[model samples]
Target: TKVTREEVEHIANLARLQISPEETEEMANTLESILDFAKQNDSADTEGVEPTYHVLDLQNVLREDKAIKGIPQELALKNAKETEDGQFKVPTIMNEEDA
Candidate 1:
């Protein structure tokens, strides 16, 4: 559908845009093209097609929450290349100024 200059100005105003005279002409063409695309979709057959919110079947795949007796901290850190007093040791990645 061909949109008017007035319609383009109204749309620009709604979007809080300051449109120049040249920009108004450009926007009129752009808005008309977008409206034309919408017109094409209007010709589609959607008589009985149910509107879908998601593209695929979605559901929570979480496991049951229960804490079992886990391995001791010392045993867990046994094979680690570097270890602190009780936890895994990591390289210092930041300087005082960066923080």
Candidate 2:
């Protein structure tokens, strides 16, 4: 149930996240609390409990797929607030100089 700061850092690295120095201990405490809560299940009675993929019998549970007509370019442009020529225009977020 005890999660170390180093372990948190390691998990962050594996998840491609960068946890700030000041928040390392806080993150460790949060993870530890979650693990401790999950540990409570260890005390449950499982003598006759059978492990299975799901508790309910599920089937395909999918909807029929069919192609629907898309909105026309003129209609889409009318709905949009900003447009350039005949296409949707957006802000240039990424900097080319960084590349």
Candidate 3:
């Protein structure tokens, strides 16, 4: 199957692309060759085959939802410049007068 120059120009316009006079012919040839190759699927023996989405039988595979131990508080604040009672002591967000 081969596409006409007008068809190529229309498709190029649809794809929001610009094709030069020389490139238009080249694109027409390439696209028609691809179309011919794609059309060969019509002669395939897929009459009895089910429309398979995945090769493996899987549906919404998720990870295990088990509780896991996180890092200790001491280790979590190990690199802090200041610490108080095994916790981070950063700058206060509000003044005592505001409180």
Candidate 4:
């Protein structure tokens, strides 16, 4: 699982990243140790345990949905910089044929 400084440099080149020589050496050692730890952990036996998606046993404590009166049309349009026929006006998008 030990990766060399040259291998780290090659990876950086493939990813199009610029790295100093010192950083390449440091990252190579760190990643090699992490890979070794993962390899060791994978060998442990885990027989009858069911695979669970979430580690926590939590539930959604949400409030009940209720209908309420929305903002009035006149009040909503009052602060608009550009309004046309009681509606906010925006720049024209793509033509209908293009869409």
Candidate 5:
């Protein structure tokens, strides 16, 4: 599953990256190893088993829920570049009226 120079160069060019000769070889080896690992995983036997999102019983990593006493909303938004209606005004990525 090792990547060839021609393939690696083509990939780098398509990705708009400029890599040196050393970097090209390193990237090729890394990508090839990942592909080899994926191929190995694909060769596993899991016929009747149900698909899983997580194999481990992952627990939620929560931090302190209480708010600090001193910081006011006006002071918080003071350092911000732009603010409107007492809220951080960001670029309208999605159309607001669509909601």
Candidate 6:
């Protein structure tokens, strides 16, 4: 899988990343190696092995459901930069109405 320098630059631009020429070159080489490794891995045979979602054999050790003490509202709100009423203030997100 041969990736061109121009392609790498285009991908970086799409990601809103400001990469220097040196960094771009470095990243291109690194990404090429990673792709090559994946290409090699794809050639391996896993016929008998079961497809695994989790590698570890562990069961969920859940605690008994009960009402527990939680952090006070004032203490949690103290670290916020901006708050409206008792809630944290954030930038307005686009809604379906805008569309």
Top candidate (TM-score):
6
Candidate 4 structure quality by residue, lDDT tens digits, 50-95: 8889999989979879978999999999899999998999877788
TM-score of each candidate structure, all chains considered together: 0.46, 0.49, 0.45, 0.39, 0.41, 0.50
User: How many clashes in each candidate?
Assistant: 0, 0, 0, 0, 0, 0
Tens digits of lDDT, candidate 2, 1-99 = 668888999998899887897889999998899888889999989999888888789888987898899988898899888999889898776887531
User: Model 6, poorest ten-residue lDDT window?
Assistant: 90-99
Q: What clash pairs does model 6 have?
A: none
- Candidate 6 regions off by >4 Å? 1-33, 93-99
Query: Model 1 segments beyond 4 Å from truth?
Result: 53-99
**Per-residue C-alpha lDDT of model 6 across residues 1-99, encoded as one tens digit per residue:** 678889889998789788889888888888899988778867779879788998889999799989889899998899999998889998776887532
lDDT per residue as tens, model 1, 6-87: 9889988788888998999988988778888778867889999998898989798898988899899988998999898998
The reply for model 4, stretches above 4 Å from the true place, is: 44-99
Cα lDDT of model 6 overall? 0.85
How does each model score on lDDT? 0.84, 0.86, 0.86, 0.86, 0.85, 0.85
**Superposing all C-alpha atoms, what RMSD in Å does each candidate have to the true structure?**
13.8, 6.1, 16.3, 11.1, 9.4, 5.7
Candidate 6, position 93, lDDT: 65
Model 6: how far is 71 from its true place, Å? 0.5
Expressed as tens digits, the lDDT of each residue in 65-84 for candidate 3 is: 99889999988988988999
